[PDB]
PDB file of C-alpha atoms and ligand atoms in Angstrom:
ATOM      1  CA  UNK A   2     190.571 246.013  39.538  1.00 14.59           C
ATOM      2  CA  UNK A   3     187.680 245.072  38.181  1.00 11.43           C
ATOM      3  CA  UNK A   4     187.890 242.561  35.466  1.00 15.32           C
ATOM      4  CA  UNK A   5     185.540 242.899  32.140  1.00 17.31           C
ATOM      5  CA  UNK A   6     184.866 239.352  30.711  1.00 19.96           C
ATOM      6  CA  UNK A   7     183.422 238.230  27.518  1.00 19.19           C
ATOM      7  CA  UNK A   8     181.752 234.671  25.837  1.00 20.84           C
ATOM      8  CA  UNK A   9     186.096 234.698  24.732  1.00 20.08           C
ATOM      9  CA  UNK A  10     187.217 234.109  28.060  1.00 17.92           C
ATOM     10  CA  UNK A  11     184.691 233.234  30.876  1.00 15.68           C
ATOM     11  CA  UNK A  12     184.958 229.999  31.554  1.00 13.89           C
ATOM     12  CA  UNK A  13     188.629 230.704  32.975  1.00 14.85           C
ATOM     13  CA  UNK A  14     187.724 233.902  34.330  1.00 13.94           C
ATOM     14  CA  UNK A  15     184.737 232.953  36.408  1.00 12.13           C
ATOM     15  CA  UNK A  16     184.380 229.204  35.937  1.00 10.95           C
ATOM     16  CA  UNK A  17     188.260 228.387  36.862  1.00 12.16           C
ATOM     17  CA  UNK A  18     188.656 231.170  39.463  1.00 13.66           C
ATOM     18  CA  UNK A  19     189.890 229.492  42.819  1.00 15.78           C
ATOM     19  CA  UNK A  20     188.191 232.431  44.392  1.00 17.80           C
ATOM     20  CA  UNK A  21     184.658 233.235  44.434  1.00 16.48           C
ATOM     21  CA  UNK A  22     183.300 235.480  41.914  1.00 12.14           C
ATOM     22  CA  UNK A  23     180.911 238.484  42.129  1.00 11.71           C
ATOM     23  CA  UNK A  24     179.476 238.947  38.370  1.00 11.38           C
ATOM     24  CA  UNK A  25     177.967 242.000  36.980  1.00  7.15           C
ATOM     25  CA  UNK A  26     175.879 241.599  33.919  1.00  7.80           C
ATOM     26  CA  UNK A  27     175.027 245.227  32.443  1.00  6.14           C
ATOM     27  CA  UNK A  28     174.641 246.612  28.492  1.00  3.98           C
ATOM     28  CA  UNK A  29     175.732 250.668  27.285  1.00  3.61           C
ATOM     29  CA  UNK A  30     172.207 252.008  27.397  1.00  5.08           C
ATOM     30  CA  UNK A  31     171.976 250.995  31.760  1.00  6.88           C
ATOM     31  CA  UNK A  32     170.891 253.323  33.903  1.00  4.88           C
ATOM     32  CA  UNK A  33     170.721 251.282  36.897  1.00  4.69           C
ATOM     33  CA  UNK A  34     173.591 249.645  35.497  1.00  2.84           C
ATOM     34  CA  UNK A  35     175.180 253.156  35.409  1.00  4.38           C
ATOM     35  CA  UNK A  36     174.142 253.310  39.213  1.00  6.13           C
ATOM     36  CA  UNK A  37     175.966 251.011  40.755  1.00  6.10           C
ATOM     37  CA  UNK A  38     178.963 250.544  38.441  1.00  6.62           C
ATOM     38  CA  UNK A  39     181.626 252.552  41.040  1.00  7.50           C
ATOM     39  CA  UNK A  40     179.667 250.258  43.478  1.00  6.44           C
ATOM     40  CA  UNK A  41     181.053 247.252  41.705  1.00  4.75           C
ATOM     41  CA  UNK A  42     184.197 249.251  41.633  1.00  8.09           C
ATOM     42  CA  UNK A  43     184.758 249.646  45.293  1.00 11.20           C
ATOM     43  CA  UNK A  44     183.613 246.209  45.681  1.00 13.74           C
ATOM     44  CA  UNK A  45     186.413 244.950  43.803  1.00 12.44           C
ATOM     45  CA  UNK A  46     188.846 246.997  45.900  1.00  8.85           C
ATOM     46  CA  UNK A  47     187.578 245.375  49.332  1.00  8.35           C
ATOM     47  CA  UNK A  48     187.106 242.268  48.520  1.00  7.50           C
ATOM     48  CA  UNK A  49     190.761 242.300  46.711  1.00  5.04           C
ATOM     49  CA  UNK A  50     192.153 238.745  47.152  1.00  9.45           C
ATOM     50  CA  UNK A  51     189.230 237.152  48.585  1.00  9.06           C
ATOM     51  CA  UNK A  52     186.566 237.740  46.248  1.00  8.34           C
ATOM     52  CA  UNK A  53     187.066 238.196  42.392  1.00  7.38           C
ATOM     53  CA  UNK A  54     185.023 240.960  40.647  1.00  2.20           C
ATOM     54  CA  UNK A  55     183.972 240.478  37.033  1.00  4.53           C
ATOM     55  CA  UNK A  56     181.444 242.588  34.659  1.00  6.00           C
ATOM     56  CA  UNK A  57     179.911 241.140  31.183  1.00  6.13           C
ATOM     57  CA  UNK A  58     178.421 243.134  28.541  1.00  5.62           C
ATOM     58  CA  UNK A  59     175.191 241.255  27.579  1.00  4.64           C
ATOM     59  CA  UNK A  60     174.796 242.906  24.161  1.00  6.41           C
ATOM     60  CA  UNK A  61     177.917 242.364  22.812  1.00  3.88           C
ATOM     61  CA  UNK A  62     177.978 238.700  24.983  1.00  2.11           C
ATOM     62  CA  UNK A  63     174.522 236.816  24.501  1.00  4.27           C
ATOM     63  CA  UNK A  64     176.003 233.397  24.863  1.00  4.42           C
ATOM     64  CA  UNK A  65     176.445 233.462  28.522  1.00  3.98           C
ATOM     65  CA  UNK A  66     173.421 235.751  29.132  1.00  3.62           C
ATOM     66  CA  UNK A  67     171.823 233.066  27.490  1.00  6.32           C
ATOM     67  CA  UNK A  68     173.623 229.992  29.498  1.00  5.23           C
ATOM     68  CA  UNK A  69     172.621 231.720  32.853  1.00  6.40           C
ATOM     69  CA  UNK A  70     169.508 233.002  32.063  1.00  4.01           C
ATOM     70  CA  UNK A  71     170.235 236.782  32.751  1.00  2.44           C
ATOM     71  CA  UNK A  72     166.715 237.979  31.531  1.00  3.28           C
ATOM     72  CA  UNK A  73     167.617 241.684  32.639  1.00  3.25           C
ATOM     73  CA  UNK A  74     170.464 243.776  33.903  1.00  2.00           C
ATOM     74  CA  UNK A  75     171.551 244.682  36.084  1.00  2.02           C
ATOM     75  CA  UNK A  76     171.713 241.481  37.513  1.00  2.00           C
ATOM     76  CA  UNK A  77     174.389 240.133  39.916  1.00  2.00           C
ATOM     77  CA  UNK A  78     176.085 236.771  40.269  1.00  2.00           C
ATOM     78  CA  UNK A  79     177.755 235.105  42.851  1.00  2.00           C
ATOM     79  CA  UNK A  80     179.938 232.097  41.224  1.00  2.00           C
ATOM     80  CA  UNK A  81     181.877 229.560  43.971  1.00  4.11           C
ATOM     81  CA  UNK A  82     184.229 227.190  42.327  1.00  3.54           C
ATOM     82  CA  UNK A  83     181.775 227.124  39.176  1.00  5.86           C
ATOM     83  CA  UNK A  84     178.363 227.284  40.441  1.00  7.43           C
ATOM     84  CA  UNK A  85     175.919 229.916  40.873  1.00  6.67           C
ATOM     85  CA  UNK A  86     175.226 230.153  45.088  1.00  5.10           C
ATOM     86  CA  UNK A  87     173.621 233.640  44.715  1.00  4.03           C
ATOM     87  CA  UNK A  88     171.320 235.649  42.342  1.00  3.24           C
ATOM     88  CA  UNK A  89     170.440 239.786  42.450  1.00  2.00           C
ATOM     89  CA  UNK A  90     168.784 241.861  40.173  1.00  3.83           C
ATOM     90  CA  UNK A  91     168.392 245.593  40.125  1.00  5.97           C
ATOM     91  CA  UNK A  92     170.372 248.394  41.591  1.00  7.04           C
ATOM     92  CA  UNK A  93     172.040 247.325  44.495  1.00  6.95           C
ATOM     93  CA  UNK A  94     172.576 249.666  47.752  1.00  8.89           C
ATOM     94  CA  UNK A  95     176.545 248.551  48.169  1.00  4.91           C
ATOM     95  CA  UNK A  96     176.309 247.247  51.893  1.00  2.35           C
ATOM     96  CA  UNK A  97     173.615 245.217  50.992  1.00  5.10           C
ATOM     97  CA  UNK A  98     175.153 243.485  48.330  1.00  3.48           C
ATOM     98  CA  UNK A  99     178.104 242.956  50.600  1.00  5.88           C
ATOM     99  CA  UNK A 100     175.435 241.477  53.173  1.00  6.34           C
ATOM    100  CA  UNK A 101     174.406 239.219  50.400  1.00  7.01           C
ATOM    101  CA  UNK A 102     178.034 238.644  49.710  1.00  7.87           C
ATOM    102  CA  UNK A 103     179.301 237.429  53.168  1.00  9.78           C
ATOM    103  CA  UNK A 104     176.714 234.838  53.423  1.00 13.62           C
ATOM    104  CA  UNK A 105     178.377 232.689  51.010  1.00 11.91           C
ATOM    105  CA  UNK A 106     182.500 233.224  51.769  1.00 15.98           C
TER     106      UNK A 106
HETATM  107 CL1  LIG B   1     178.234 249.777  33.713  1.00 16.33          CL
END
């Protein structure tokens, strides 16, 4: 349930989502990225319908790294009707993202 989005098709993904969207940005070689991937997972599965989770591959998608200024991964994005309300880096503990989450839905 968790959707993997490229430069191809973000702006309807994320941009154009009428819910708000959680975005992972990660890359293969990851091991924090590794770490909190099935956190991102079950994210996706209770947030279903409310919140819209979304990962990007910044090797193989360096336009939108770029456009958002991801300068590592993993870092995390919050998007509400096209605009960034929230910004995390690193490997996230799960309730504290969802803390960081419920601040801005
Ligand atoms: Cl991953």
């Amino acid at each position: 349930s968790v959707i993997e989005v490229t430069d191809e098709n973000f702006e309807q993904e994320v941009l154009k989502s009428d819910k708000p969207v959680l975005v992972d940005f990660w890359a293969p070689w990851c091991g924090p990225c590794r770490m909190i991937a099935p956190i991102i997972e079950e994210l996706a599965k209770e947030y279903e319908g409310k919140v819209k989770v979304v990962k990007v591959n910044v090797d193989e998608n360096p336009n939108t790294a770029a456009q958002y200024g991801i300068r590592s991964i993993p870092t995390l994005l919050l998007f509400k009707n096209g605009q960034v309300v929230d910004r995390k880096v690193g490997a996230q503990p799960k309730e504290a993202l969802k803390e960081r989450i419920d601040k801005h839905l």
